[PDB]
Amino acid sequence: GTILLDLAPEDKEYQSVEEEMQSTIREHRDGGNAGGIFNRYNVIRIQKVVNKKLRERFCHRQKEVSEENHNHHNERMLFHGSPFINAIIHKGFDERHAGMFGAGIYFAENSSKSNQYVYGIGGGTGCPTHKDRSCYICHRQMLFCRVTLGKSFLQFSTIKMAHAPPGHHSVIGRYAEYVIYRGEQAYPEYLITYQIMKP
Numbered sequence: 001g002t003i004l005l006d007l008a009p010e011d012k013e014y015q016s017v018e019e020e021m022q023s024t025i026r027e028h029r030d031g032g033n034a035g036g037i038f039n040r041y042n043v044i045r046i047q048k049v050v051n052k053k054l055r056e057r058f059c060h061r062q063k064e065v066s067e068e069n070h071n072h073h074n075e076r077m078l079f080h081g082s083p084f085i086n087a088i089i090h091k092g093f094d095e096r097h098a099g100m101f102g103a104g105i106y107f108a109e110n111s112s113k114s115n116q117y118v119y120g121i122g123g124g125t126g127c128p129t130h131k132d133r134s135c136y137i138c139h140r141q142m143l144f145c146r147v148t149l150g151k152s153f154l155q156f157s158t159i160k161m162a163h164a165p166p167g168h169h170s171v172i173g174r175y176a177e178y179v180i181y182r183g184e185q186a187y188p189e190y191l192i193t194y195q196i197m198k199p
């Protein structure tokens with residue numbers, strides 16, 4: 001099954017991920033409505049996710065994508081946030097649960113943007129305990145994942161697509177939203193447990 005590797009705060013790895021999480025905070029059109037109001041996370045712990053089977057599907061899909069894209073993975077580390085993280089680290093991303101660019105699995109370069117989703121679309125009703133979307137008490141989680149974009153399609157309006165266009169493997173949707181339509185194309189590498197910190 002899935003085991004979690006407990007990175008150390010003094011790990012050059014750990015540090016690299018918190019810096020990506022910390023440096024990609026930004027302001028959002030909703031004025032902090034969904035994700036709450038903060039300038040910085042209090043990173044409780046960072047964990048590397050290890051799953052035999054998920055690595056295998058990810059590796060296998062990696063080859064097909066490659067053959068169809070001048071033999072390049074075109075992989076990327078992107079943040080994903082969801083109320084579904086527990087199932088994702090245990091069974092991987094599932095497009096059968098899959099928006100502005102169709103029935104896909106969404107990622108983004110800004111940790112803050114994924115933060116909006118940890119309690120659901122538009123932040124839902126905030127933490128279960130304090131019903132607070134800006135809650136500074138409750139621990140949140142997100143994922144820094146390896147994503148196989150393959151040959152990306154670029155959409156510029158909103159479109160309801162089920163799969164990437166032929167010859168493509170992902171959709172970059174315009175801030176850009178990274179969308180794949182196959183779970184295998186993302187592995188959930190880093191489980192991040194954190195708090196938003198009152199400014």
Ligand SMILES: O=C(c1ccc(F)cc1)C1CCN(CC(=O)N(Cc2nc3c(c(=O)[nH]2)COCC3)Cc2cccs2)CC1
Nearest residue numbers: 080081084087093094097098105106107108114117120121
């Ligand atoms: O893989 C999935 C899964 C796996 C296992 C399981 F048990 C249940 C689902 C699903 C597949 C559909 N996914 C769509 C999705 O990612 N949603 C949230 C979301 N949207 C965006 C970003 C982000 O970080 N998270 C970042 O960019 C902006 C869009 C949109 C959302 C829909 C519902 C809640 S958030 C959400 C996860």
Ligand SMILES: [Zn+2]
Nearest residue numbers: 127130135138
């Ligand atoms: Zn709370």
